[PDB]
Structures are given as C-alpha cells and as structure tokens.
C-alpha cells in the first residue's frame, strides 16, 4: 500500500541527505554516528523548526548544514548555541564538526515544517478540522499546486479511528517525473497517539 514517495524517486527527482564514500571496514562505523546525530539534534531543536540535516564527509573530518526557517533563534547573539554545540557534537562524533545554517524562506512549502505545526495545534485542544482547513489554504495562497493532508488516530472519540482526508489541487503519485515532499510527525495528546501525513506537491519535472 503506497510505497514511500522518496524511496521510489532517489534519482530522477531527489537525492540523498548524506553523501560520503566508505570502505567495507568502516561503512557501519559512520552510520551509527550519523543516526544518533539526527536523534540528538531534533531533541535539542524542538523549537526553531528544522526540516533537513545534511551531512557531507570531506577529507577526514565533517560538514553539517542544519536548515531552519528561523536562524536567529539558533544563532543567538553571534553563535552562543553554534560554538556550544560544536564543542559537543565532537563528543558523539570524534571528528571536528562544521555547522552551517541556511534559511527556509517560504516555510509553508516544506512538509516537515508544516506537520510540526499540526502537532502543536492538536495538542492545544484545537478542533481537528479548523486547524487544518486553515493550514492548507495558507499553504495555497503562496506556492504549491496540490496538497493532501491525512489526519488519523484517536481524534478525540471513545473507540474511534477515523481518518480526515482533505485535499486541494492536483497530486500525482504514480509519476516518477514529479517532485513530491513527504513527512510524518506524530502527536501525543492526553489520550491516544495521532499521526499526521503530508504530501506537498511542488512543480513537476
């Protein structure tokens, strides 16, 4: 059922989030670094929303480009968090670490940034649909050509597992030529676990 919309297009649309060659004797000693970096960084940057954390390995050290749509929260008073983490990313990843920060201008057209706001609204006890009818039209005044948002879970009920489904525009999924974003962020309410899926469709080719 609906094979993951990145794993079919690694190639014709998108590329990896981490590029580095490794021998067969060190391949599984760089993965375990790069997988507990991403669990570390998102638990620290719970605010100052983060979409993508890329990692390059040049000759013998590192490079990391953390993407936020609000860089001023992370770079606060000239890198009081930047040099503080750069001391302490080396303690998990023994090479010296670079940290680079870009902007995510138009923050309402990347799926991770959108779906983090859905968990925020649905844990403030906002209505399950008034939160989302406004979170699609706002992401259609500027930008995209199609948006699907599925909201599944407890949805407040007693024994209820309904799925909200609202769509606008055009979203293909069996065209490999197209360009689709995808993100699943969850939510822990005072009862039940709500999972949210987002399918922002940018332009094709």
């Amino acid at each position: 059922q609906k094979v993951h919309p990145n794993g079919i297009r690694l190639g014709i649309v998108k590329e990896h989030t981490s590029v580095w060659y490794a021998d067969r004797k060190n391949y599984a000693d760089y993965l375990f670094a790069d997988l507990k970096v991403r669990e570390y960084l998102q638990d620290k940057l719970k605010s100052a929303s983060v979409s993508r954390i890329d990692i390059h390995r040049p000759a013998q050290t590192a490079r990391i480009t953390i993407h936020t749509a609000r860089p001023g929260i992370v770079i606060g008073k000239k890198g009081e968090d930047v040099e503080k983490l750069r001391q302490d990313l080396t303690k998990q990843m023994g090479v010296p670490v670079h940290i680079n920060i870009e902007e995510i201008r138009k923050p309402e057209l990347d799926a991770m940034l959108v779906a983090q706001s859905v968990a925020q609204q649905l844990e403030r006890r906002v209505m399950f649909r008034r939160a989302m009818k406004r979170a699609v039209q706002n992401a259609m005044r500027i930008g995209a050509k199609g948006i699907k948002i599925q909201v599944s879970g407890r949805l407040g009920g007693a024994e209820i597992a309904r799925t909200e489904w609202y769509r606008e525009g055009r979203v293909p999924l069996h065209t490999l030529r197209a360009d689709i974003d995808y993100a699943t962020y969850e939510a822990h309410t005072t009862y039940g676990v709500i999972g949210v899926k987002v399918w922002i469709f940018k332009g094709e080719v």
Binding site: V19, W20, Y21, H56, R57, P58, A59
Partner: protein, 96 residues
Amino acid sequence: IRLKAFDHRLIDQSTQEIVETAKRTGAQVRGPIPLPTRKERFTVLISPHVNKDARDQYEIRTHKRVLDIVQPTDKTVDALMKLDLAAGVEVQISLG
C-alpha cells in the same frame, strides 16, 4: 589514478575536472577507462509480524574509473585534490 564513488553523476563528472585541469598544465593524460561495477543485492523482509511472501529488494552500486598520465611533471593536481574531491569521491593515486 583510480576513483570510487556511488553515483555516475559525480564520478564521471569529476574526471573532466581532472582531465582538463591537468592537460592544461602541459602533461599528457589519456582518456579515462571504465571498470566493472560492484553490485550488491539486499533482499529484506518487510512485515513486522510475519507474512513471508511480501518482500523488497535493494541494490547498492559502486562506480570505478581509472585515469592514465603519460609524463609526470605536474604537482598541480596534488594541490587541487580538495577541489577535485567534492562529496563522495575517493581518489587513490597511481601516477603512471
């Protein structure tokens, strides 16, 4: 010279970054030669609790690529190695 990377939109696009940037400095470097390709299939099971006949199988590639100088007189590419390494290319040197 021998090169190892993971996608042909880097490693066969960095040879021109070496062939042009060494033949400019006088020394003759011939055309690069392809090698056979590493191919490794990984068939993994997909269901958490068991249903065996649903599977999924991947493949990891490794492209190789060999250069060939004629007259070694340039240490220009020795300084221009951090330029010619970009993201995932490894270069072992065989300066023939």
